[model samples]
Target: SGGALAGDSLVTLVDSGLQVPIKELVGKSGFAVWALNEATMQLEKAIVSNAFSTGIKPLFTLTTRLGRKIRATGNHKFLTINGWKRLDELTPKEHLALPRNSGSDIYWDEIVSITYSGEEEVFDLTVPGLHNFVANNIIVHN
Candidate 1:
């Protein structure tokens, strides 16, 4: 892991590259992976379902600026994009249907949005961790 890792201010890829802020991706057809800690690790993941390809298959790959390579591809049904909470307690929010975008107050510089689809049914999921996944590489065809 070398090269200049991305800071808290990382770039987000929309379902169609709409040029909107990554924070807004939580909603809309809004979707994309984010690298949280560009330094320690360049991890990334999903935050919603219907984000990747449906039938044909989605190809994911990351060519780290540090030269580490990784790839993952498949259907994400219960993937919960991990992130941080805060020093204080987090209030319980209502559960929505199929999409949940980053709140307007959510700082893109602090938390990394990983792969998300639905909440876990048989396990515990954590949040607010460093992003150590690929942001680019491979082809998410149309």
Candidate 2:
């Protein structure tokens, strides 16, 4: 399920109907769905880090996967990676505060691939509101 690529987007697959604590999910599975509100553009400072190794890897490898996957299910815009940063490069206080803030190693910003509708969508798995979006609003099959 890992390391698979769909054009400029990365593939992240999870089991359905499994719900864990929001903080726990972000702490352990920060790579895909983490602190959406804390992430920032690549050029700016990110409040939280991703759970995986680095955000750059996915930015170049699977940047558009999420958007493309979501678009096929409905009239949704494509998902696009706007920016990213690694956790180790953050300030000492920021780095140490990561665990407390429910962050991980690398962090990135994403937005819908649309012109005027540039609003960002927060990907939170623990929230029931996102359950239908993440599970049913998918284009790729495992």
Candidate 3:
């Protein structure tokens, strides 16, 4: 899975007040999708540094299809810990699985892609950010 994000790919930044399309996820839910985008943006930045080893540029954007509910009924506790879990704890294989399950009162889903920012209002989607998302995307349930 790590290798998937590795290589010469575009990057984008979304976490922590970064540029992100939250309206696509909020959808009149009146939820805090901005924060979720922020978190994903931050994680993507980190992923670029650690996994891809590249810079930011234009044409950067990550589109999370859409979520059914703010958080899964049976699963409600996704953003409890940072985003990094042990191999036995969460493992890189199950990293994506964590975010898939709405384990907390949050509106989010599988972080689509990582791209770079360009043009007047471009963005950056580094691997570090993706790494953060993947690493911390799950609840680490055993």
Candidate 4:
């Protein structure tokens, strides 16, 4: 049931080609950004259905090899080689899915650790058709 993403997480805005934070998207809608197409397993331009705060909650930092990490609620799910798995459900043994290039296709990254981070006001986005978005360069379920 978790859907909140840490407010400070960065999202790519296709228009300005800037890495904007999720908190900055509050009350905003109908914007284009890069997100993953789960079925096709490719990065594509997707529209933001909406953005809002999910109140303050405990967040966890899941760091992967190559320094990729996402700070979010434990219930938040990310794509694994097998399928979408909660951040807390990931172990170092399993690889997380990540885009290898702007070319659209994705590859895998090894998780290094999942650590407890303090509470913060969390944010979330609804990506319409895709139902997933990119944060810290990782594909996350929205």
Candidate 5:
């Protein structure tokens, strides 16, 4: 019932800004995450309520113009200047938001490509308030 990311997809931790694999945090709860607060149009620290495996699913790999990439399920939504949009809703003209300075600000980049990358086990997180987090360096819906 939720969007999920590939097991290897790395999430930016709020504390040290470390890119950590989502799968490794599955059993842990209450960890802080880097997320966007759409209302404020700014980055903020959100708490992860829970995380777990979502089994296997079809995957799509999105490569940005800046060379940043993220692998996620078709259901996952990403933040765009326009709003949160699913993979199928994205267009070549869209620029996804990427965080900078450890959540102090954000920048935009073009999505250069989106390709089906086969099936694999996926993971998802529960970010209490915003329902979004930074995964693979990009803002994404939880």
Candidate 6:
């Protein structure tokens, strides 16, 4: 995300081939100038303003444990979702019974945790990266 600067003459300062050395100054000031998954580093090209507000930093960046390219999976005897109920106990009908415009949505990369149980066999989201995984398991515990 930090290659080939566009725009007019004012934008030429961004692609002078010396961005790393210049941006390193801000990176040393607690705010890591990283352009991992989010398109944010572009805005940090040339920032020379007073950043005095609070602690060591203000609006820092944070990537999901790992980058978005890496996905993980696990197993459990039983999983729970959509409130205080077991995964298998709820039917498919109940799973899809969510209110409209709840604004609840889940990304495959954002599912960092899950509650589960196990016996002799195992139970869990079969294909955790697929759409059905979050479709039927939209429970936010905030």
TM-score of each: 0.20, 0.17, 0.21, 0.94, 0.92, 0.16
Clashes of each: 20, 10, 44, 0, 0, 1
Off by over 4 Å in 5: 101-103
- What's the C-alpha lDDT at position 25 in model 3? 24
Can you write out model 6's per-residue Cα lDDT over 8-42, one digit (the tens) per residue?
00111224422232212322332222111112211
Q: Could you tell me the TM-score of candidate 4?
A: 0.94
Looking at model 2, the pairs that clash are 8-62, 8-63, 9-62, 9-63, 10-62, 42-83, 42-84, 50-105, 50-106, 67-79
lDDT against the true structure, each candidate: 0.25, 0.23, 0.26, 0.86, 0.86, 0.20
By TM-score, the best candidate is 4
Candidate 2 or 5, higher TM-score? 5
User: 1 or 4: which has the higher TM-score?
Assistant: 4
Please give, for residues 77-132, the per-residue lDDT of candidate 1 as tens digits.
Answer: 11112322221111223110111134211112211122222221111111223322
Candidate 1: Cα lDDT at 3 = 14
Error of 3 at 102 (Å): 14
Candidates ranked, most accurate by TM-score first? 4, 5, 3, 1, 2, 6
lDDT of 6: 0.20
After superposing candidate 6, which stretches have Cα over 4 Å from the reference?
1-83, 96-137, 140-142
The C-alpha RMSD of each candidate to the native structure, in angstroms, is 16.3, 15.8, 13.8, 1.2, 1.5, 18.7
Which ten contiguous residues of candidate 1 have the minimum total lDDT?
1-10
lDDT of 2 by residue, 1-142 (tens): 1111112222233324242322233344323322223233111111223222211122111112133222121222222232222221222112111111122332322322422212222222222212111222221111
Off by over 4 Å in 2: 1-16, 19-24, 30-116, 121-135, 140-142
Worst 10 residues of 2 by lDDT: 92-101
> Candidate 5 residues 1-142, lDDT tens each?
4689998889877789687899999899988988888877788889999999989999999999888899988888988877888987888758998877453688899989999999999999999899988888888996
Candidate 3 lDDT by residue in tens digits, 1-142: 2112112222123344333331222222211111133333322122232222222222322323342111111111233244533222322212123333433334334434333333222111222222233322322111
lDDT comparing candidate 4 with the true structure: 0.86
TM-score winner between candidates 2 and 4: 4
Please give the lDDT score for candidate 2.
Answer: 0.23
Answer with 1 or 2, whichever has the higher TM-score: 1
